[PDB]
Design an enzyme around this catalytic site. Structure first.
Site, PDB file in Angstrom:
ATOM      1  N   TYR A   1       2.163  -4.777  12.014  1.00  9.45           N
ATOM      2  CA  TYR A   1       1.991  -3.312  11.942  1.00  9.45           C
ATOM      3  C   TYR A   1       2.731  -2.602  13.081  1.00  9.45           C
ATOM      4  CZ  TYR A   1      -1.847  -4.179   8.544  1.00  9.45           C
ATOM      5  OH  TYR A   1      -2.577  -4.646   7.420  1.00  9.45           O
TER       6      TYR A   1
ATOM      7  N   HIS B   1       0.813  -1.250   0.000  1.00 12.61           N
ATOM      8  CA  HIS B   1       0.000   0.000   0.000  1.00 12.61           C
ATOM      9  C   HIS B   1       0.836   1.286   0.000  1.00 12.61           C
ATOM     10  CE1 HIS B   1      -3.880  -2.281   0.851  1.00 12.61           C
ATOM     11  NE2 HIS B   1      -2.998  -3.126   1.432  1.00 12.61           N
TER      12      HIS B   1
ATOM     13  N   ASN C   1      -9.928  -3.146   3.145  1.00 13.73           N
ATOM     14  CA  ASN C   1      -9.701  -3.073   1.720  1.00 13.73           C
ATOM     15  C   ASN C   1     -11.038  -2.794   0.996  1.00 13.73           C
ATOM     16  OD1 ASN C   1      -6.890  -3.563   1.571  1.00 13.73           O
ATOM     17  ND2 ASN C   1      -7.108  -5.813   1.340  1.00 13.73           N
TER      18      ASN C   1
HETATM   19  C1  HDD Z   1       1.311 -10.202   8.204  1.00 19.35           C
HETATM   20  C2  HDD Z   1       1.443  -9.245   7.309  1.00 19.35           C
HETATM   21  C3  HDD Z   1       0.209  -8.635   6.786  1.00 19.35           C
HETATM   22  C4  HDD Z   1      -1.050  -9.267   6.472  1.00 19.35           C
HETATM   23  C5  HDD Z   1      -1.501 -10.711   6.519  1.00 19.35           C
HETATM   24  C6  HDD Z   1      -1.832  -8.103   6.077  1.00 19.35           C
HETATM   25  N1  HDD Z   1      -1.173  -6.915   6.124  1.00 19.35           N
HETATM   26 FE1  HDD Z   1      -1.915  -5.032   5.726  1.00 19.35          FE
HETATM   27  N2  HDD Z   1      -0.110  -4.262   6.045  1.00 19.35           N
HETATM   28  C7  HDD Z   1       0.992  -4.912   6.510  1.00 19.35           C
HETATM   29  C8  HDD Z   1       1.079  -6.203   6.797  1.00 19.35           C
HETATM   30  C9  HDD Z   1       0.026  -7.200   6.594  1.00 19.35           C
HETATM   31  C10 HDD Z   1       2.210  -4.032   6.822  1.00 19.35           C
HETATM   32  C11 HDD Z   1       3.541  -4.512   6.272  1.00 19.35           C
HETATM   33  O1  HDD Z   1       2.443  -4.027   8.259  1.00 19.35           O
HETATM   34  C12 HDD Z   1       1.704  -2.669   6.351  1.00 19.35           C
HETATM   35  C13 HDD Z   1       2.580  -1.866   5.423  1.00 19.35           C
HETATM   36  C14 HDD Z   1       2.811  -0.475   6.030  1.00 19.35           C
HETATM   37  C15 HDD Z   1       2.066  -0.479   7.312  1.00 19.35           C
HETATM   38  O2  HDD Z   1       1.895   0.419   8.155  1.00 19.35           O
HETATM   39  O3  HDD Z   1       1.571  -1.789   7.474  1.00 19.35           O
HETATM   40  C16 HDD Z   1       0.307  -2.975   5.817  1.00 19.35           C
HETATM   41  C17 HDD Z   1      -0.389  -1.975   5.240  1.00 19.35           C
HETATM   42  C18 HDD Z   1      -1.831  -2.037   4.923  1.00 19.35           C
HETATM   43  C19 HDD Z   1      -2.656  -0.893   4.483  1.00 19.35           C
HETATM   44  C20 HDD Z   1      -2.248   0.523   4.252  1.00 19.35           C
HETATM   45  C21 HDD Z   1      -2.572   1.299   5.550  1.00 19.35           C
HETATM   46  C22 HDD Z   1      -2.210   2.726   5.179  1.00 19.35           C
HETATM   47  O4  HDD Z   1      -2.868   3.325   4.287  1.00 19.35           O
HETATM   48  O5  HDD Z   1      -1.228   3.237   5.701  1.00 19.35           O
HETATM   49  C23 HDD Z   1      -4.001  -1.451   4.360  1.00 19.35           C
HETATM   50  C24 HDD Z   1      -5.266  -0.773   3.901  1.00 19.35           C
HETATM   51  C25 HDD Z   1      -3.795  -2.850   4.720  1.00 19.35           C
HETATM   52  N3  HDD Z   1      -2.527  -3.166   5.051  1.00 19.35           N
HETATM   53  C26 HDD Z   1      -4.929  -3.774   4.789  1.00 19.35           C
HETATM   54  C27 HDD Z   1      -4.939  -5.211   4.993  1.00 19.35           C
HETATM   55  C28 HDD Z   1      -6.172  -6.032   4.883  1.00 19.35           C
HETATM   56  C29 HDD Z   1      -7.590  -5.607   4.569  1.00 19.35           C
HETATM   57  C30 HDD Z   1      -5.606  -7.366   5.146  1.00 19.35           C
HETATM   58  C31 HDD Z   1      -6.291  -8.676   5.136  1.00 19.35           C
HETATM   59  C32 HDD Z   1      -7.438  -8.742   5.781  1.00 19.35           C
HETATM   60  C33 HDD Z   1      -4.155  -7.152   5.337  1.00 19.35           C
HETATM   61  N4  HDD Z   1      -3.817  -5.853   5.334  1.00 19.35           N
HETATM   62  C34 HDD Z   1      -3.218  -8.241   5.685  1.00 19.35           C
END
Ligand code: HDD
Ligand code: HDD
Ligand code: HDD
Ligand SMILES: [Ca+2]
Ligand SMILES: [Ca+2]
Ligand SMILES: [Ca+2]
Ligand SMILES: [Ca+2]
Lengths: 671, 674, 319
Positions: free
Chosen positions: B349, B62, B135
């Site tokens: 996160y 994202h 999402n």
């Molecule tokens: C185990 C790792 C992992 C898993 C399974 C998911 N995510 Fe995630 N997500 C992340 C690890 C992550 C992250 C690497 O931790 C991010 C990247 C930057 C941040 O702050 O978190 C992230 C970012 C991120 C953002 C951007 C937030 C923003 O605008 O700053 C959204 C909307 C989502 N995620 C949504 C989801 C949804 C709806 C999931 C399934 C239901 C999902 N993520 C599963």
């Protein structure tokens, strides 16, 4: 003021996360009462993640130190010599923060290591923060900034085993000193009592480099900064400093904390030597050379203002650990010189804060903020705490109406480089021949010390050099010392079983200069805060009454009094078990306690007498109030600094002059 | 403005250093007028060092996104289902910040890539910050958080050459999809119009996981979060999305920025599906499984309140770039479930913000701060902005009188885990077999789209799969598609020159569910903000007059109107050179401009291309003024076509054209497989 | 070579942690088959922790770019004009790495944006790494490095909304150009077909600044570096560039990758204009001024050697 706005009060309320959610933090979330901890336990993870990341890199040098807030007050309108705003009117006050430090030790090392000491002062002026990052010794080891990692590598612990901590007494340090003779002058200051001050309040501060004062008309003069202690100058003796390092590694930061809390905040006169640009080479050395002082006989001190420290920090880490000084924090009215040591510092301090802060926005931390508005086009970066409204951060622009405006000599009270400065010649990596006399000034310094002080300096060299393993290093050391003084080299060599090389008189002379001696600087101007230990006993009611009588008479004159006995009770502050002579500036035994001095489960064998004997041996004023004690101690009743009265009021009057005299130097043998 | 306290104004004043010393920053200090620059030039080094350090790591996923400030207002006192303080009173208002995004692309990649989109919402509540990190598609690709790096590595560019940007159209991604059949459901959503929304304002948001609502008495219910757009649902067509990616990479962020600045801030109803703990496996699937939706026929949406975004950030980096969402930012009244995808997110996160911020004090950044006091014993760390008074930061203590106090279910309104939750059984690294049906729900989804939507989905698959070089991967892909639908597999195989495998009917069915179709959701509820390009000419003063008349009548219905001509002047917003059909939701030609349908001022055929492109992409098009045959004939557009308008009268033209804009897309212009 | 020794092969073998213990990475450890995930799951955390920290800050400029390995071969013993060891013998070969880039876009922005392009070459010489960090246009926008953040803030996206990506087509850029007239020369080059080259292989590289070649006897001459393409110069047209940005954001990096994989690695003659110190102001402008070219009519090119790119990286991030 950014300091008050960022204070966080936790004296009431429920525990919250950093996002304001009320939580608990005492038990982990588990799958059943004897089960495994769950990953979804956010309370556990946020708490331990913070803990895990609490530490930041210690400063590369001056890692061990302590700070306090205060005020600077100008004595006059100094516009005649500098445009500097904080000096522009009688009585003008500017908040300050000062940090004191050693140089070589890591952040947990003892205050009373033998070392050069830092004295760094920030003036939060109404035209920007101005830092004077100075030392307690007016001259520095090396003549070019590029050599700084060589000096520091050599004095820091040997890099295979990281031994020894906070000490020059090992082969690498003396190898460097003997191969790089620019070191002699600072080496002699650090080997004197200046290397082991009694407290941060009892030392001076120096800018070291020549700087320029610049007037609004653009004319300049050359200056040295001196911060002259109003508490007087005082030192430990080496054998005392060693024990103190072990008994109380926090000795100097404790002393500063305590003096401030008791309403006895330390003071300095902020002074300059001022000379004309045409005098750069007029005194027999180059004012660009940071290994030289200007003798006071050639340029007297002008007093500009008063520096007072009077408030302790609220949180050590946020204020003292996080303060990030820079000699590049300069303000209109001051300018740099071409001292090759100063020139290179300007680069290092801006760069090293990235290491400490882990990000470029370190000037946003409350302690580093200025107390005036900021207007510039610096943006983004990790840890960005501002929300900039100007969406056209470039110059020249019309979309933000050409703001911020450029500031310079003519407009906006801009900083400007002294306009008389020029450069000429080849671009070179050469040292000026004018820097080449490395030995005359150390000899001048040595000449200016009293005989006892000269002996203490010789003995510091005997101690350190005798610990150097290499016979070749020791010889090379004697070669250099011999160029400053044959007698020094002879007396040093005596302790290490080598012969001194023959006298080389090229740099020898008999000139002296005023104000560099500590012993020679007369009695202390004040005895407030000095520490008196009264050695007493609970076995005799007369001892405690005698102790209490003495207490009230001494505390009236601002002395910090500790009554010591076998066990605590009303009137007794410390047990013999925790007491040591390093804790006191003078020691009084109340005659009622005579029996302790002649075994107990309450303290180690011989402790009460050891305290009295160490105090005497270390030159401190000692007495008995009520002579069995003096004979147990082998302490002659006629000795200067030994007090014996039956009368309380006569005891105290005499003892207090002893405290001012501070040390009785007739107790130390001379060669 | 909720963050006004941290704003810095530079509308006046002299340049200073960061420590307030006035300086200049336009010329280096040199040894002589043509001399070398000096090391003592601190003005130069402070400015350049700041610049040298401006960038921070992009988000690991994202990375491309845009955000805005808003308000959430509760429609009721929801105390009877949840203790959550922000939902405890009719009309209660809590500030919010929302960031929307794509998933796969880096910073600077195009908004209109095909992708899953993020919709992340922070509520700054009076009992702590609460984030819903959702999402635009309600189901996720994978069933266990530990597989996230596998998914993301497979979709992101191939690691030898870093190609291709922001696209699943490459071998590794379809290799993963075909080996990991859990992916099928989200894959079908992303291949539909939901993968290419018309704007952030025209998509929904979903929490994806089942969560819990928890009452003050400890009773809980299972919930899904749905943010239902009040602007309606709308998508691009692929061929338009690709051109738009080039012509305007910032399409979605500009659309959101513009809607807010024009007083048309977008709105969503924040809803939940609510079900009992006893219904966890009652619907023929496991509520713990993040690859499944609860069909609305089994559990209707309950509207909790209104989300409105109405204020753009002041500094993008400081607000949108630095906002650090966490599903771990939870409040009393909400709890987690044992969804294994959710469970691992809780770890990621908190950890990943250390990478982004470069230090542990990221919750002190203005955009991340809560709007209530903080009392805890967290101390020090790089970047520490607080000066803590309490010199006894440990529990239990007497020296600070036992403060801060422990908060829990019974004191200080503490968060508490739902007390009816239990675990039992072996410590296992096993997948529950209740998660094993990967195919019935993608088929449910596919059955619920209109015939043309079904074609668009098939065509998106044909497009991407035809770009997979490995014949073995293409075969594996057809195998999985075939388990969802034989017809899909046959239709996709046709484009890539393979035969589909024999039908396998284990998971085939004919059930449908409401609300998942975009084309099937009827006309848009509002046409405010839609873009109408009026193609005119400066050759004829009457064409400009006609354009002006049309502008007045369209603007009074809140449409954004661009008049295009050869050159700019009063009344003309854009030149033909910069104009493109991806720039409009409908295109009108004024009949005075018929002749334009060569010049050194725009590329050959540009005015006609705009009209033909718009028609081919399904948009309402027309000619206003009465003489329409030359334009329509040049364009090969039939005068009687649906969504094709010709009227002499401006008033009558606009009335009809506005119905066409609400219809949004005219689906009879697209061919269907027999 | 430091590259070969640090290559890691995973074509066989069982999955291991970073400390060599064999493990699995497909299912979390849970209390019960439908239970919560356990904190003691080190396999999960080590894998996610790595993923969570994979990104690093993009370059402050030239963030979008691509690279390749090759060789430089000197044509002569150039000892008569420079002591440089990589130029000291006919036929002497030095390994090189080159990275090409745009200036203004972030790392996922399109290759075929209109912009100045980077052409940065590292020579791993037997007397140290030598870098020529050049552009495809021989003159720069500004005359003093202290103005670089002003130029860059003005061309990059407006800071309130971060629009527009990778483009000078907005008010702040033109405000800067029109207020800071030094920009005109580079502006003209960037507005020509030099701003939208057909490929990295169809552009030239320039050191931009005047540098010095120093002989062992200590005498010096002034030089400009020119890397002259053997593929010829070619450009897109703007209407085409815009569509290409959407249809293939990776166009230049793909073009370079494919040319190398097919045995058509691109080549440049590495050349210098060489003039005497006395000529610093002889040509009607100052050779210290980076907004000026020396017309080839006043100083002809000398060809020093051949630069050829012929090997793609193994791992894009690491190289
Ligand atoms: C185990 C790792 C992992 C898993 C399974 C998911 N995510 Fe995630 N997500 C992340 C690890 C992550 C992250 C690497 O931790 C991010 C990247 C930057 C941040 O702050 O978190 C992230 C970012 C991120 C953002 C951007 C937030 C923003 O605008 O700053 C959204 C909307 C989502 N995620 C949504 C989801 C949804 C709806 C999931 C399934 C239901 C999902 N993520 C599963
Ligand atoms: C070029 C390298 C270099 C040179 C030649 C010097 N220093 Fe320095 N100094 C540093 C590089 C440095 C540093 C690495 O940048 C430090 C460490 C942490 C910091 O903020 O700066 C520092 C710390 C530091 C501190 C501690 C400041 C504080 O309490 O936070 C003091 C008092 C000094 N120095 C004083 C001096 C004096 C009086 C010098 C000679 C006249 C001197 N330094 C030369
Ligand atoms: C004072 C700042 C400054 C100025 C005046 C310039 N640059 Fe620069 N340049 C940078 C500061 C910078 C930088 C911020 O330091 C970068 C970004 C990341 C890096 O490694 O250096 C950079 C990156 C960078 C790259 C990418 C190297 C790579 O592929 O990783 C190229 C090709 C150039 N620059 C070329 C130039 C040319 C030809 C210049 C004018 C003659 C120029 N730069 C002026
Ligand atoms: Ca050693
Ligand atoms: Ca870091
Ligand atoms: Ca691939
Ligand atoms: Ca702009």
């Amino acid at each position: 003021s950014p300091l008050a706005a960022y204070e966080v009060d936790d004296s009431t309320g429920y525990l919250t996360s950093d996002v304001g959610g009320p939580i608990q933090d005492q038990t982990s979330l588990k799958a059943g009462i004897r089960g495994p901890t769950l990953l979804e336990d956010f309370m556990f993870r946020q708490k331990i993640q913070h803990f895990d990341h609490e530490r930041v890199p210690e400063r590369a040098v001056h890692a061990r130190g302590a700070g306090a807030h205060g005020t600077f007050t100008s004595y006059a309108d100094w516009s005649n010599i500098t445009a500097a705003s904080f000096l522009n009117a009688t009585g003008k006050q500017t908040p300050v923060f000062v940090r004191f430090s050693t140089v070589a030790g890591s952040r947990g090392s003892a205050d009373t290591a033998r070392d050069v000491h830092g004295f760094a002062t920030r003036f939060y002026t109404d035209e920007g923060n101005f830092d004077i990052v100075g030392n307690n010794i007016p001259v520095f080891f090396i003549q070019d900034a590029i050599q700084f990692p060589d000096l520091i590598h050599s004095v820091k612990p040997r890099p295979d085993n990281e031994i020894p901590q906070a000490a020059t007494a090992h082969d690498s340090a003396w190898d460097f000193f003997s191969q790089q003779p620019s070191t002699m002058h600072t080496l002699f200051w650090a080997m004197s009592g200046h290397g082991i001050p009694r407290s941060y309040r009892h030392m001076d501060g120096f800018g070291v480099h020549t700087f320029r004062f610049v007037k609004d008309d653009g004319s300049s003069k050359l200056i040295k900064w001196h911060f002259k202690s109003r508490q007087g100058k005082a030192s430990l003796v080496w054998e005392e400093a060693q024990v103190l390092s072990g008994k109380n590694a926090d000795f100097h930061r404790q002393d500063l904390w305590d003096a401030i809390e008791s309403g006895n905040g330390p003071e300095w006169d902020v002074c300059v030597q001022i000379v004309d640009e045409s005098q750069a080479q007029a005194f027999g050395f180059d004012l660009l050379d940071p290994t030289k002082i200007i003798p006071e006989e050639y340029a007297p001190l002008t007093k500009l203002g008063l520096l007072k420290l009077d408030r302790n920090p609220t949180n050590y880490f946020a204020e003292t650990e996080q303060v990030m000084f820079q000699p590049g924090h300069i303000v209109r009215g001051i300018d740099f010189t071409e001292d090759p040591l100063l020139q290179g510092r300007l680069f290092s301090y801006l760069d090293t804060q990235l290491n400490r802060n882990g990000g470029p926005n370190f000037e946003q931390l409350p302690i580093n903020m200025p107390r005036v508005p900021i207007h510039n086009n610096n943006r983004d970066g990790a840890g960005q705490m501002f929300i900039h409204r100007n969406k056209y951060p470039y110059t020249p622009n019309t979309l933000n109406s050409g703001y911020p405006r450029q500031a310079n000599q003519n407009a906006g009270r801009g900083f400007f480089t002294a306009p008389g400065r020029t450069a000429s010649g080849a671009l070179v990596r050469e040292v000026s021949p004018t820097f080449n006399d490395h030995w005359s000034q150390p000899r001048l310094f040595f000449n200016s010390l009293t005989p006892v002080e000269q002996q203490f300096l010789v003995n510091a060299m005997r101690f350190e050099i005798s610990l150097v393993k290499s016979e070749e290093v020791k010889k090379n050391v004697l070669t250099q010392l011999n160029r400053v003084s044959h007698d020094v080299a002879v007396r040093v060599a005596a302790a290490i079983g080598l012969g001194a090389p023959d006298a080389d008189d090229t740099y020898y002379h008999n000139n002296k200069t005023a104000g560099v001696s500590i012993v020679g600087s007369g009695p202390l101007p004040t005895i407030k805060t000095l520490r008196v230990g009264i050695l007493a006993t609970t076995s005799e009611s007369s001892a405690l009454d005698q102790a209490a009588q003495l207490r009230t008479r001494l505390e009236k004159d601002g002395l910090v009094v500790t009554v010591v006995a076998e066990t605590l009770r009303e009137g007794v502050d410390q047990t013999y078990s925790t007491a040591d002579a390093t804790g006191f500036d003078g020691v009084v035994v109340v005659d009622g306690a005579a029996a302790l001095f002649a075994s107990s489960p309450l303290f180690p064998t011989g402790r009460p007498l050891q305290i009295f004997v160490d105090a005497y041996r270390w030159g401190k004023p000692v007495g008995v109030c009520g002579s069995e004690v003096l004979d147990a101690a082998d302490v002659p009743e006629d000795g200067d600094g030994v007090y014996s009265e039956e009368s309380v009021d006569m005891f105290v009057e005499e003892f207090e002059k002893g405290l001012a005299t501070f040390r009785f130097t007739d107790r130390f043998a001379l060669d």
